[PDB]
């Protein structure tokens, strides 16, 4: 009856704790499309369509960041999220953001959207960004504060917004974008998180974000 994608976007992007593993050794299985990181409670399984990258990462110490969802028994899944552990930046870089809210542009940078990775996954930046947008603009509704109240509750999220895009602007002239309100075919994380299966990375010092949020009735 309902759209499970609404609660799932809000939960998985803004309430559930992100995966944040540093310098963890992959288990080096024969599985071509997965890396696997074991701990005392569960195994985290990363899936990617970049088999060549994953082959190179087999048995290496790696960083993992993003959104996980439940697997059978003591397993959890994440799409991509994996980076190498060869070099880092000397400190956290806050990613510069150009943001348009109902067509009105401003700029912001925040400790809440930052990385010290030399190459960071687009996933890590995106999930941090959406958590921040929920905090500041209540984009998915029910953020639990008064921040973003000025935009109303007209959308099916009980928010002011139902259209939005994050655009990664590379030093290039290249870009790529994700839809902030994409719920996949069924509103389930196995579907909507699949956008991260390329394990796309960006050079952290050499990109910025353009963000757009709006409403259409």
**One of 33, 56, 102, 116 touching a copy of itself (CB under 8 A):** 102
Query: Per CB under 8 A, does 188 bind a copy of itself?
Result: yes
Report what 217 binds from Cl ion, a copy of itself, none; CB cut-off 5-8 Å by kind: a copy of itself
Report what 104 binds from Cl ion, a copy of itself, none; CB cut-off 5-8 Å by kind: a copy of itself
CB 88 within 8 A of CB 82: no
Tell me how far, at minimum, the Cβ of 123 lies from Cl ion, in Å.
Answer: 12
**One of 25, 49, 147, 153 touching a copy of itself (CB under 8 A):** 153
Contacts to Cl ion by CB under 5 A: 16, 72-73, 83-84, 93-94, 119, 152, 154-156, 158, 162, 170, 184-185, 188, 191, 202-203
Which residues on adjacent β-strands are paired with residue 19?
66
Tell me how far, at minimum, the Cβ of 130 lies from a copy of itself, in Å.
Answer: 17
**One of 72, 86, 111, 172 touching a copy of itself (CB under 8 A):** 72
Tell me the residue nearest to Cl ion as measured from the CB.
152
SS (H, E, C) the chain: CCCHHHHHHHHHHHCCCCEEEEEEECCCCCCCCEEEEECCCCEEEEECCCHHHHHHHCCCEEEEEECEEECCCCEEEEECCEEECCCEEEEEEECCEEEEECCEEEEECCCCCEEEECEEEHHHHHHHHHHHHHHHHCCCCCCCCCCCHHHCCCCCCCCCCCEEEEEEEECCCCEEEEECCCCCCCCCHHHHHHHHCCCCEEEHHHEEEEEEEECCC
Report what 151 binds from a copy of itself, Cl ion, none; CB cut-off 5-8 Å by kind: a copy of itself
* Residue closer to a copy of itself (CB basis): 2 or 30: 2
Tell me the C-alpha distance between 217 and 215, whole Å: 7
* Residue closer to Cl ion (CB basis): 189 or 211: 189
Query: Per CB under 8 A, does 217 bind a copy of itself?
Result: yes
How many Cβ atoms are within 10 Å of 192's Cβ, its own excluded? 23
Query: Rule CB under 8 A: which residues touch a copy of itself?
Result: 1-2, 4, 7-8, 11, 15-16, 69-70, 72, 101-106, 150-155, 158, 160, 186, 188-190, 215, 217
């Amino acid at each position: 009856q309902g759209d499970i994608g609404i609660d799932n976007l809000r939960n998985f992007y803004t309430k559930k704790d992100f995966v944040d593993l540093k310098d963890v050794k992959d288990n080096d299985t024969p599985i071509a499309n997965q890396l696997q990181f074991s701990n005392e409670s569960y195994d985290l399984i990363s899936e990617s369509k970049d088999f060549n990258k994953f082959s190179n990462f087999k048995g290496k110490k790696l960083d993992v960041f993003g959104i996980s969802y439940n697997g059978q028994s003591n397993t959890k899944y994440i799409y991509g999220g994996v980076t190498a552990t060869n070099e880092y930046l000397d400190k956290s870089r806050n990613i510069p953001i150009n943001i348009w809210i109902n067509g009105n542009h401003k700029t912001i940078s925040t400790n809440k959207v930052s990385t010290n990775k030399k190459f960071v996954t687009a996933q890590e930046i995106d999930v941090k960004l959406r958590k921040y947008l929920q905090e500041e603009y209540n984009i998915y509704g029910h953020n639990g504060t008064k921040k973003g109240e000025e935009y109303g509750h007209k959308s099916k999220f009980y928010s002011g917004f139902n259209i939005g895009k994050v655009t990664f602007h590379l030093n290039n002239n290249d870009t790529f974008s994700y839809d902030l309100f994409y719920t996949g075919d069924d509103g389930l994380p196995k579907s909507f998180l699949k956008i991260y299966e390329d394990n796309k990375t960006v050079e952290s010092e050499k990109f910025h974000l353009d963000v757009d949020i709006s409403y259409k009735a």
